[PDB]
Enzyme design. Sequence first.
Site, short mmCIF file in Angstrom:
data_model
loop_
_atom_site.label_atom_id
_atom_site.label_comp_id
_atom_site.label_asym_id
_atom_site.label_seq_id
_atom_site.Cartn_x
_atom_site.Cartn_y
_atom_site.Cartn_z
N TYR A 8 0.77 -1.24 0.00
CA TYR A 8 0.00 0.00 0.00
C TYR A 8 0.80 1.29 0.00
O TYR A 8 0.25 2.36 -0.28
CB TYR A 8 -1.00 0.00 1.18
CG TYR A 8 -2.13 -1.00 1.01
CD1 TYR A 8 -2.05 -2.27 1.58
CD2 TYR A 8 -3.23 -0.70 0.21
CE1 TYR A 8 -3.04 -3.23 1.33
CE2 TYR A 8 -4.22 -1.65 -0.04
CZ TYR A 8 -4.12 -2.92 0.52
OH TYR A 8 -5.08 -3.86 0.24
N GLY A 19 2.96 4.15 -1.61
CA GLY A 19 3.40 4.56 -2.98
C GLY A 19 2.32 4.26 -4.01
O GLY A 19 2.55 4.05 -5.20
N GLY A 66 -1.08 1.91 -3.94
CA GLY A 66 -1.51 0.62 -4.34
C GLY A 66 -2.93 0.50 -3.82
O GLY A 66 -3.57 1.49 -3.47
N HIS A 93 -4.00 4.99 5.73
CA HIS A 93 -3.89 6.33 5.16
C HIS A 93 -4.69 6.40 3.86
O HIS A 93 -5.28 7.43 3.55
CB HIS A 93 -2.41 6.68 4.92
CG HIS A 93 -2.20 7.99 4.23
ND1 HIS A 93 -2.29 8.14 2.86
CD2 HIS A 93 -1.92 9.22 4.72
CE1 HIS A 93 -2.07 9.41 2.54
NE2 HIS A 93 -1.84 10.08 3.65
N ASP A 94 -4.72 5.30 3.12
CA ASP A 94 -5.48 5.25 1.88
C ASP A 94 -6.98 5.24 2.17
O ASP A 94 -7.76 5.82 1.42
CB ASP A 94 -5.11 4.02 1.06
CG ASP A 94 -4.42 4.38 -0.24
OD1 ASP A 94 -3.29 4.92 -0.18
OD2 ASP A 94 -5.02 4.13 -1.32
N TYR A 148 -7.87 8.87 2.95
CA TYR A 148 -8.01 9.72 1.78
C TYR A 148 -9.31 9.40 1.06
O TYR A 148 -9.97 10.29 0.53
CB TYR A 148 -6.82 9.50 0.83
CG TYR A 148 -5.66 10.45 1.03
CD1 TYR A 148 -5.46 11.09 2.26
CD2 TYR A 148 -4.74 10.68 0.01
CE1 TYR A 148 -4.38 11.94 2.46
CE2 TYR A 148 -3.64 11.53 0.21
CZ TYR A 148 -3.47 12.15 1.43
OH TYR A 148 -2.38 12.95 1.63
N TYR A 191 -2.11 22.47 2.57
CA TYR A 191 -2.66 22.86 3.87
C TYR A 191 -1.51 23.36 4.72
O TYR A 191 -0.35 23.11 4.41
CB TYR A 191 -3.36 21.69 4.54
CG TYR A 191 -2.49 20.48 4.79
CD1 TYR A 191 -1.49 20.49 5.76
CD2 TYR A 191 -2.66 19.32 4.03
CE1 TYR A 191 -0.69 19.38 5.98
CE2 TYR A 191 -1.86 18.20 4.24
CZ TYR A 191 -0.88 18.24 5.21
OH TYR A 191 -0.07 17.14 5.41
N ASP A 226 -2.74 12.77 6.97
CA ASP A 226 -1.29 12.78 6.81
C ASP A 226 -0.56 12.70 8.14
O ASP A 226 0.45 12.02 8.27
CB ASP A 226 -0.86 14.05 6.06
CG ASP A 226 -1.23 14.02 4.59
OD1 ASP A 226 -1.97 13.11 4.18
OD2 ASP A 226 -0.77 14.91 3.84
O1 LIG Z 1 4.21 10.49 0.17
P1 LIG Z 1 4.61 9.10 -0.26
O2 LIG Z 1 5.00 9.10 -1.74
O3 LIG Z 1 5.86 8.75 0.52
O4 LIG Z 1 3.41 8.05 0.01
C1 LIG Z 1 2.64 7.15 0.89
C2 LIG Z 1 1.24 6.61 0.56
O5 LIG Z 1 0.56 7.61 -0.18
C3 LIG Z 1 0.42 6.22 1.79
O6 LIG Z 1 -0.85 5.74 1.36
NA NA Z 2 -4.99 25.02 0.20
#
Ligand SMILES: O=P(O)(O)OC[C@H](O)CO
Ligand code: NA
Lengths: 121, 121
Positions: A27, A29, A31, A47-48, A51, A64, A89
Amino acid sequence: SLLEFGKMILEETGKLAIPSYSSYGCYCGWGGKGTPKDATDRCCFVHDCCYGNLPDCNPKSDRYKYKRVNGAIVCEKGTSCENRICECDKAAAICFRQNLNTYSKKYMLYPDFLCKGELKC
Amino acid sequence: SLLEFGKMILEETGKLAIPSYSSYGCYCGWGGKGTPKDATDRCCFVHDCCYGNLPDCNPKSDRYKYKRVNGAIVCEKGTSCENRICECDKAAAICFRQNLNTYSKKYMLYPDFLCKGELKC
Ligand SMILES: O=P(O)(O)OC[C@H](O)CO
Ligand code: NA
Ligand SMILES: O=P(O)(O)OC[C@H](O)CO
């Protein structure tokens, strides 16, 4: 936006979002399939799901504002979106840290292929 | 430099950096806009995101050395830049191979108007 999320991860973990988390497990990066490999991977998952519950927002792009109070991440007030995104986040980043001691290089650049099936969020 | 990056690509995928990965999707190449369309397209999005963390270097031309150890790509030692540039490339080439499975010709010479959202890194 990824800009805040990325530099948020480096503040908490000490690692740079890209190579450390851009393709970790199933997940991390972005997926969406398979059974999370470990703890760190479970956070990308959650986290996915986080979102995914912001249909009215643009999570990957909206910038933000946030500050660190006594070493803690604090999401400044902005729009309904900026606030919910920031919290998503923050939760992921903090988790990353909590599970650093289980971070396995063994899962960086993990074959997305090996991940099969859709888990309910 | 791209001469090394292209070599890894041909080695890991068997395809030539040029056509196969120079006009594929929304990111493999130079255009750089919208939302990655698939596994391979993401591999290239993450890659010039990686090149963006190297302001003090110039990835296009500085040449580095790498070799294989038990068949794995290993970046030989050198200047901080050469090493970081190489890690970006190393990961990208491996990403292309892990996704040779979903690589489809329908994404070649993909039209500009089909590359949607706003995405930054
Ligand atoms: O900000 P990244 O590229 O390190 O990503 C992490 C994933 O989006 C978590 O779901
Ligand atoms: Na903004
Ligand atoms: O054909 P290349 O070597 O330019 O490959 C892919 C993208 O440029 C990566 O950003």
